């Protein structure tokens, strides 16, 4: 059924979001970051204020 297809799509997205929630945050979301922790020249790409 179409509803069932929606359910597979949703369950895939829930698996992705659960994995993302478990995963350690990106360096930008760690609060304090030193040059060693983050990739070298990571701030070059990113836009920071």
């Amino acid at each position: 059924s179409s509803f069932e297809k929606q359910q597979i799509e949703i369950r895939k997205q829930i698996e992705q979001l659960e994995n993302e929630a478990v995963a350690e945050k990106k360096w930008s979301l760690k609060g304090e970051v030193k040059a060693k922790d983050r990739p070298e020249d990571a701030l070059l790409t990113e836009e920071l204020e």
Binding site: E40, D41, L44, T45, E47
Partner: peptide, 21 residues
């Protein structure tokens, strides 16, 4: 090898900065 990687990082920096402007 390391020099080429540094060059590639410089190219990425340059193209991103170009996209900004």
């Amino acid at each position: 090898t390391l020099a080429n990687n540094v060059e590639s990082k410089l190219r990425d920096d340059l193209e991103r900065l170009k996209k900004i402007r």
